[PDB]
């Protein structure tokens, strides 16, 4: 009685909605433009084929077979149960700050319901004497009339929270609570709108932007192969990092979503379809951004390089600046901000569902008490998200975005891959998959699970640690204690594995050998362990593909 999905289309839509987030539609086209373009697809496709698909398949299959949450699937290796807490903490940390972009989108949407947009000129009370008519009026409106950033001196001078953004945060929190309090029976029908509206808005945006003058010259700059940029060891690193960070792995959301699936459904086809859709969405959406950027560059007589920005300064400054020059600008602004709002609401409920399912599956007291636990979680998230709505909240946002999910997601994914493929065994995993579906994975999948994925993940982790630069916002330089706090957050997320491993080893009874045997063997093999035969205590178990 684990409350399976109402329909199968509810699962696919939920996964697609979680995967497609705000960063999906701007990061990949910019990365393609920077690293050649067209030729950048070769490292991306190679790394994707050899790393991303096997990890997606492994997560889906593990979640579906074990019928539990992120921390409950570790009855196959009891000593490695800390990685579930690690991924839950990562999701909580990301959600602590991902709910402020949606508040900004709500603020802009409410402000766009007028016959004269407030960011078209600088004659208001929030504009400095020097102006473009000197920073542009759009940027001045964004970071001087909305954020009120000019009243802060850094992360050590924050100030009281702003009520105009606190109201939007409250609205977002109320929507999040009422979209998740009854489980997946109601959460699977919400995604019928939020996972399909972005495509409807993007089609109209592309149709409008294609006809703009100079949009073709912005598209040619997007798809122009080089093939001589593959000789530099910066394109491959960027491709590997993008492959690692573009999938939904490392959060525990996929395991939680799969735990509600039927036992005998086919997860291979589902993984293939979801991955194909997620990868095609970014490539397709790259056609609108660069058409608009080419239109703007032709308007200002400047190269596209100086126009193509990144981060929150693109969708809140650059995009609502070309719209104001279009006929019927208010309607276009309204639909654009509706799309922005609906594109990151299903990536914030997926993370919350991951946390809630993972914590409920462990303690049985929080069973049938689903509304109260959800209320407590959303209240805690709202309380801890009040730091980013102050005068200097953009600094806290930048710090959290830099340190919350990075070098820890890769660590958790590598640990879980090692646990699944080495401690448990690829043979047992293949037998379980053959038990669920009707067919056994081939040699390619087992080889990728055992050898290629761990080495790739370890190389990515090492290159992420070695090449590290502190965050910044404009000309501001963060102090030392901010970097110390970021490192403390990252290490606190990552340090769940050793502490739980030590506690588990110390709690078990007996001598060293019995403790080890009960700690590394699956809970389903308890009879064999009691009899005295352990699979892991042999040479042939670790050298088997």
Ligand X SMILES: COC(=O)[C@H](c1ccccc1)[C@H]1CCCCN1
Ligand Y SMILES: *[C@@H]1O[C@H](CO)[C@@H](O)[C@H](O)[C@H]1NC(C)=O
| Residue closer to Cl ion, measured from CB, 91 or 246 | 246
| Closest CB to ligand Y among residues 128, 196 | 128
Both tokens of residue 377? Answer: 């979680």
In the complex with ligand Y, which residue's Cβ is closer, 4 or 127?
A: 127
Question: Per rule CB under 6 A, is residue 151 in the interface with ligand Y?
Answer: no
Q: Check if the beta carbon of residue 256 is closer than 8 Å to that of residue 15.
A: no
User: Of Na ion, ligand X, ligand Y, none, which one does residue 351 interact with (CB within 5 to 8 Å by kind)?
Assistant: ligand X
CA angle 543, 544, 545 (to 5 degrees): 125
Closer residue to ligand Y, CB minimum distance, 150 or 513 = 150
Of 246-275, binders to ligand X (CB under 6 A) are: 248, 251
- C-alpha to C-alpha distance for 270 and 418, rounded to whole angstroms: 24
Q: What is the number of other CB atoms lying within 10 angstroms of the CB of residue 148?
A: 18
**One residue of 152, 347, 381, 464 binding ligand X per CB under 6 A:** 347
Beta carbon nearer to ligand Y, 114 or 132: 132
Does position 26 bind ligand X by CB under 6 A? no
In whole angstroms, the minimum distance from the beta carbon of 265 to Cl ion comes to 27
Alpha-carbon distance of 169 to 287, in angstroms, equals 32
Q: How far apart (Å, rounded) are the C-alpha atoms in residues 507 and 498?
A: 14
* Residue showing the smallest CB distance to ligand X in the complex: 351
Q: Yes or no: say if 81 and 504 are a contact pair by the CB < 8 Å rule.
A: yes
The total of other beta-carbon atoms located within 10 Å of residue 501's CB is 16
21 binds, among ligand Y, Na ion, Cl ion, none (CB under 5 to 8 A by kind): Na ion
| CA quadruple 188, 337, 376, 402: dihedral, nearest 10 | 110
Buried b (16+ CB within 10 A) or exposed e, 16-54: bbbbbbbbbbbbbbbbbbbbbbebbbbbbeebbebbbbb
Q: Check the annotation: does 348 bind a ligand.
A: yes
Q: Is 129 in the site for ligand Y (CB under 6 A)?
A: yes
Total of chain residues touching ligand X, rule CB under 6 A: 13
> Segment near ligand X (CB under 6 A), from 44-52, 292-300, 312-320, 344-352?
344-352
Contacts of 55 (CB under 8 A, 6+ apart): 247, 249, 413, 417, 453
For ligand Y, the closer of residues 130 and 538 by Cβ is 130
- Tell me if 525 is assigned to a ligand binding site: no
Of 241 and 428, the one with the shorter C-beta distance to ligand X is: 241
Residue numbers at the binding site for Na ion (CB under 5 A): 20-21, 24, 246, 346-347
The region of 80-88, 96-104, 125-133, 401-409 touching ligand Y under the rule CB under 6 A is 125-133
Residue from 35, 111, 246, 464 touching Cl ion (CB under 5 A): that is 246
Q: Is 21 in the site for ligand X (CB under 6 A)?
A: yes
Residue pair 389/158 in contact (Cβ under 8 Å)? The answer is: no
In the complex, what is the shortest distance from the CB of residue 286 to ligand Y, in angstroms, rounded to a whole number?
A: 35
Helix (H, G, I), strand (E, B) or coil at 188: helix
Site for ligand X in 77-96 (CB under 6 A): 91, 94-95
Q: Does the footprint of Cl ion cover residue 28 (CB under 5 A)?
A: yes
Helix axes 409-418, 82-111, angle to 10 degrees: 140
Name the DSSP letter for residue 425: I
Residue 476, phi then psi, degrees to nearest 5: -80, 140
Closest CA to 286 of 12, 26, 78, 16: 26
CA distance 530 to 526: 6
The CB density around residue 529, as the number of other CB atoms within 10 Å, is 19
Residues that bind ligand Y (CB under 6 A): 121, 123, 128-130, 133
Positions touching ligand X (CB under 6 A) are 18-19, 21, 91, 94-95, 98, 248, 251, 347-348, 351, 405
The binding site for Cl ion (CB under 5 A) comprises 24, 28, 246, 282
Return binding residues: 17, 19-21, 24, 91, 95, 242, 245-246, 278, 282, 343, 346-348
């Amino acid at each position: 009685d684990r409350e399976t999905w109402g329909k199968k289309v509810d699962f696919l839509l939920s996964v697609i909605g979680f995967a497609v987030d705000l960063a999906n539609v701007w990061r990949f086209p910019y990365l393609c433009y920077k690293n050649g373009g067209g030729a950048f697809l070769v490292p991306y496709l190679l790394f994707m084929v050899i790393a991303g698909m096997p990890l997606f398949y492994m997560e889906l299959a593990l979640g579906q077979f074990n019928r539990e949450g992120a921390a409950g699937v570790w009855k196959i290796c009891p000593i490695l149960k800390g990685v579930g807490f690690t991924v839950i903490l990562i999701s909580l940390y990301v959600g602590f700050f991902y709910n402020v972009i949606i508040a900004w989108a709500l603020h802009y949407l409410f402000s766009s319901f007028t016959t004269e947009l407030p960011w078209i000129h600088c004659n208001n009370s929030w504009n400095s004497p020097n102006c473009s008519d000197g920073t542009t009026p759009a940027a001045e409106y964004f970071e001087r009339g909305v954020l009120h950033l000019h009243q802060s001196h850094g992360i050590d001078d924050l100030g009281p929270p702003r009520w105009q953004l606190t109201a939007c945060l409250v609205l977002v929190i109320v929507l999040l609570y009422f979209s998740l309090w009854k489980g997946v029976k109601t959460s699977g029908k919400v995604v019928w709108i939020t996972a399909t509206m972005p495509y409807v808005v993007l089609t109209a945006l592309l149709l409008r932007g294609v006809t703009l003058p100079g949009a073709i010259d912005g598209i040619r700059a997007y798809l122009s192969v080089d093939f001589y940029r593959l000789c530099e060891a910066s394109v491959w690193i960027d491709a590997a990092t993008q492959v690692c960070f573009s999938l939904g792995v490392g959060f525990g959301v996929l395991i939680a979503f799969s735990s509600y699936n039927k036992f005998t459904n086919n997860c291979y086809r589902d993984a293939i379809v979801t991955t194909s859709i997620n990868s095609l969405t970014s490539f397709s959406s790259g056609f609108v951004v660069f058409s608009f950027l080419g239109y703007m560059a032709q308007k200002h007589s400047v190269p596209i390089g100086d126009v193509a920005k990144d981060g929150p300064g693109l969708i809140f400054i650059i995009y609502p600046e070309a719209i104001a020059t279009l006929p019927l600008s208010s309607a276009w602004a309204v639909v654009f901000f509706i799309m922005l709002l609906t594109l990151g609401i299903d990536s914030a409920m997926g993370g919350m569902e991951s946390v809630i399912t993972g914590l409920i599956d462990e303690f049985q007291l929080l069973h049938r008490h689903r509304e109260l636990f959800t209320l407590f979680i959303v209240l805690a998230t709202f309380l801890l998200s009040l730091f980013c709505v102050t005068n200097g909240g953009i600094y806290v946002f930048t710090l959290l975005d830099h340190f919350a999910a990075g070098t820890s997601i890769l660590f958790g994914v590598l640990i879980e891959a090692i646990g699944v493929a080495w401690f448990y065994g690829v043979g047992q995993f293949s037998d379980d998959i053959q038990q669920m579906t009707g067919q056994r994975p081939s040699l390619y999948w087992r080889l990728c699970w055992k050898l290629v994925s761990p080495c790739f993940l370890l190389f990515v982790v090492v290159v992420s640690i070695v090449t590290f630069r502190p965050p910044h916002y404009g000309a501001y330089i963060f102090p030392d204690w901010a970097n110390a706090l970021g490192w403390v957050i990252a290490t606190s997320s990552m340090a769940m594995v050793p502490i739980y491993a030590a506690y588990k080893f110390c709690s078990l009874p007996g001598s060293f050998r019995e403790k080890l045997a009960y700690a590394i063997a699956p809970e389903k093999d308890r009879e064999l362990v009691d009899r005295g035969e352990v699979r892991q205590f042999t040479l042939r178990h670790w050298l088997k593909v």
